Amino acid sequence: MNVVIVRYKSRQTRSWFEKILMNNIREALVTEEVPYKEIFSRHGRIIVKTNSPKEAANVLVRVFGIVSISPAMEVEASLEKINRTALLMFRKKAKEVGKERPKFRVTARRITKEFPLDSLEIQAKVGEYILNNENCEVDLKNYDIEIGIEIMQGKAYIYTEKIKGWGGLPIGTEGRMIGILHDELSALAIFLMMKRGVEVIPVYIGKDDKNLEKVRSLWNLLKRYSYGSKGFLVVAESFDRVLKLIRDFGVKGVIKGLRPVSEITEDFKMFPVPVYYPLIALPEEYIKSVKERLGL
Amino acid sequence: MNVVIVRYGEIGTKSRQTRSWFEKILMNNIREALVTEEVPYKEIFSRHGRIIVKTNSPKEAANVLVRVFGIVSISPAMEVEASLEKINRTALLMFRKKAKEVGKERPKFRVTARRITKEFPLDSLEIQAKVGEYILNNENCEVDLKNYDIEIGIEIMQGKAYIYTEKIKGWGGLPIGTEGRMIGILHDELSALAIFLMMKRGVEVIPVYIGKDDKNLEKVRSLWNLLKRYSYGSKGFLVVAESFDRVLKLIRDFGVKGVIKGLRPNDLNSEVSEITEDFKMFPVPVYYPLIALPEEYIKSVKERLGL
Numbered sequence: 001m002n003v004v005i006v007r008y009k010s011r012q013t014r015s016w017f018e019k020i021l022m023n024n025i026r027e028a029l030v031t032e033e034v035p036y037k038e039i040f041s042r043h044g045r046i047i048v049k050t051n052s053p054k055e056a057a058n059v060l061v062r063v064f065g066i067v068s069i070s071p072a073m074e075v076e077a078s079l080e081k082i083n084r085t086a087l088l089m090f091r092k093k094a095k096e097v098g099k100e101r102p103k104f105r106v107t108a109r110r111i112t113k114e115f116p117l118d119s120l121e122i123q124a125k126v127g128e129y130i131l132n133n134e135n136c137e138v139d140l141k142n143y144d145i146e147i148g149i150e151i152m153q154g155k156a157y158i159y160t161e162k163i164k165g166w167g168g169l170p171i172g173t174e175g176r177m178i179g180i181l182h183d184e185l186s187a188l189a190i191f192l193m194m195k196r197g198v199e200v201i202p203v204y205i206g207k208d209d210k211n212l213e214k215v216r217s218l219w220n221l222l223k224r225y226s227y228g229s230k231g232f233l234v235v236a237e238s239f240d241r242v243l244k245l246i247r248d249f250g251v252k253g254v255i256k257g258l259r260p261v262s263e264i265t266e267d268f269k270m271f272p273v274p275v276y277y278p279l280i281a282l283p284e285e286y287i288k289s290v291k292e293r294l295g296l
Numbered sequence: 297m298n299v300v301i302v303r304y305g306e307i308g309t310k311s312r313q314t315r316s317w318f319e320k321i322l323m324n325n326i327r328e329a330l331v332t333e334e335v336p337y338k339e340i341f342s343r344h345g346r347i348i349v350k351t352n353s354p355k356e357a358a359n360v361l362v363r364v365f366g367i368v369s370i371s372p373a374m375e376v377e378a379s380l381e382k383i384n385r386t387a388l389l390m391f392r393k394k395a396k397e398v399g400k401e402r403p404k405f406r407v408t409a410r411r412i413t414k415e416f417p418l419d420s421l422e423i424q425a426k427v428g429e430y431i432l433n434n435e436n437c438e439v440d441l442k443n444y445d446i447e448i449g450i451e452i453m454q455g456k457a458y459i460y461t462e463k464i465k466g467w468g469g470l471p472i473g474t475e476g477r478m479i480g481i482l483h484d485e486l487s488a489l490a491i492f493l494m495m496k497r498g499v500e501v502i503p504v505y506i507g508k509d510d511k512n513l514e515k516v517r518s519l520w521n522l523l524k525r526y527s528y529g530s531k532g533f534l535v536v537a538e539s540f541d542r543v544l545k546l547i548r549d550f551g552v553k554g555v556i557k558g559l560r561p562n563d564l565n566s567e568v569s570e571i572t573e574d575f576k577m578f579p580v581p582v583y584y585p586l587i588a589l590p591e592e593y594i595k596s597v598k599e600r601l602g603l
Contacts, residue, residue, distance in 0.1 A: 016579050176551045250477050250551020272317050 005070040006046035021170040024228035066165030077156040083129040093160040103139035111152035169197030171228035177253035186257025192278040301371040302347035322471040325529035366471030373460035394461040404440035412453035470498025472529035478554035487558025493585040500530040
C-alpha cells in the first residue's frame, strides 16, 4: 500500500474545513512519528501518501472530523493494473481471514468520470478476475472481504479496509476555549468539546500541587485526541493568571466538568466569557456511547 | 480638586459584555493610560454607574482619559462630605475660579445636580435651587438654563459630593477589549483610520504590516505611533509579517476573531473581487469600516481628529 484515503454541520466553509483538517492530520502524524510524503484534498476526500499506511490509519482514527479511513494502494487507472492490484489486496486480506473459500464483493466508485467503464462493469470484471485466480464466491449480503475501488483523476485507489473514525468536527474549526482540568469527569468534558471542533487549552488551577501529577496523567491521555492544538497544560497559581490566559490567547469560552445552578450563577460572573458544561447540556445517551467507545 | 469623574454607558448602546465586565475592562484601560502617561493617582474604582479616579493631578488625568474609548464624559472635580454647607461653599469656590477664567462682569450660569444614591435629604432640583441661591447672593451673575458661561455640576454618592465646573466630552464608543480581538492590516492613512474606527467599537487590534524593512515601514511605524495614543488596553505593538503564512500563524496563535482592512468603495470593481478573495484567504471574517460605516459619521470622526 502507498496511501490512506481520508473521508469526511460546520460553521466553517468547505475549503477551510479541509485546510484545518489537513493541518491536524499533519500534526498528528508528525507527533506520532508516522512518515508521509504528501497530504492533499481532492474531490471531497483527503489523500495521505505514505509508506506506513496502517500506522497512519491507526493514528488518524483519533483525528476529529474524519468519518472513515482506508489504507490503500494507488495505481494508474487501467483495467489491467486495477485487476492485478485488486487481486494482490484480496490475497493479503484472504490470508488474514483464514478461510479456504472466502465470500466477497467489489464496490467501485468513479469520483471523476474519465475512466471508460462504469462502476458496475468495473465490479464485474474485477470480480471475474479474482474468481479466476482464487477459490472464493461472490456474496453481496455477507462477505469476509470487500474490495473497494475509488477512481479519481486517472488514479485508482484500492483497499479492503474502511476504518471508522470518531466523526465530529476538526479541532480549531469552532474556536478556542480553556478547559478546567482536575478529574476524569472534567477530562471527559474536554474530550466532548474537542470533538465539537473546539481547540482546548487545558488548565490546572491552584498553588497546591498534590493533584498535579494525576492531572498531567489525565492530560497525557487527552493529548492523543488533541492534534492541531498546542496541547500544553497550563498551571495557574491564582485566578488572575486564568483571566490573563483568556485575554492573551483570545479564548472565547471556558469548559467545566460539572454534572447534573448556584455554581453556574457564580461561574457566569467570575468568567468574562461563556462557561460550558458538556456533561449537563449533551444527551445522556450520547455521552454513554462516547464513554463506551473509549472503554470508560 | 482631587478626583476625576468618568461617565459611561448610553441609551440605545449595545455591549456584548455585562455591566460588571464592561466596567472592569474600562478601569483596566484607564489604569494603563495613566500609568503609560505617568499620571499619578491614588485609586480607581467603579460605583453606582460611575468610575472615580482619586488623584491630585485631575486636570492631567482628564486630558489623557479623553483618549480612552467607552468614556462618554470626564469631569475633574472636588470631593467633599455631602452636607449643604460644604456643597455650597465648594460650589461657590469653584464658581469663582471659573468666573475669573470666563472674565465677565455678570456671567450666566446654571446648577446641575444628581443624587446618584438617595440618602441626601434634598432632591436634585432642591439642591440646584439652594446652591443657585447661594451663588446669586455672593456674586454678580444670572441664571440661564439654555445659554450659560458656567455650569456648576454636583453629583452625590454614598455621603460624598463631587463638585465640578468642567465636563469634557469623551469619544464614546466601547472599551477596547469588550468586543474581541482582531488584526488590522496597516499600510496607509486610510487603513489607520479603519483601525481607529474599530478600536472605538471596543475591538482590541493587533496592527500588522505585511512587507519588508523598507521606507514604507518607517511610514507605517509613524502611523502606528499616532494610533497607539488611543489603544490603551491592548498590547499595542506593530507586527511585521514577511509573508502571508505569518499572518495566518498570528491569527491562530492569538485567537483573532476578525481582520480589518482600509478598503474603500473606490478601490473595488463591480464584482468586488477583493472582497470575495478576502473571504477565501482569511479563516475569519474581514471587516471594511470605511465601506460599512456611514459617510457623515466617518466625516465627523475625521473632523474631530483634524484630518
